[PDB]
Amino acid sequence: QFRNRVINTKSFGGQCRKVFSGDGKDFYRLSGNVLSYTFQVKINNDFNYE
Amino acid sequence: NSAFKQAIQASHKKDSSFIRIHKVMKVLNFTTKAKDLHLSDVFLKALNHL
Numbered sequence: 692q693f694r695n696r697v698i699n700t701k702s703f704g705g706q707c708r709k710v711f712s713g714d715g716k717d718f719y720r721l722s723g724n725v726l727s728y729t730f731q732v733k734i735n736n737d738f739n740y741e
Numbered sequence: 742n743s744a745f746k747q748a749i750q751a752s753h754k755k756d757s758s759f760i761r762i763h764k765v766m767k768v769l770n771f772t773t774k775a776k777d778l779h780l781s782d783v784f785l786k787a788l789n790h791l
Binding site for chain 1: 783
């Protein structure tokens with residue numbers, strides 16, 4: 692199970708670290724700490740009918 | 742007097758189909774500048790704390 696909030700992932704550190712998500716097509720502000728946050732999609736489909 | 746009739750028919754039908762597709766579409770390419778690259782602030786920090 693995922694448990695409760697441990698890291699402050701919205702600590703911006705005074706930076707204006709915009710990222711454009713091509714997926715959501717919107718500008719988002721990353722926290723100062725996060726090493727990367729990226730939006731490339733992967734879609735991984737198993738059908739198995741018998 | 743005796744009469745005998747027998748008719749037997751059997752059919753076995755076997756079918757298999759296989760398709761593998763592997764498209765790789767490039768839409769963009771880049772070259773990074775050789776010199777005076779602008780390091781990621783978080784990377785610049787990580788280096789400064791070494």
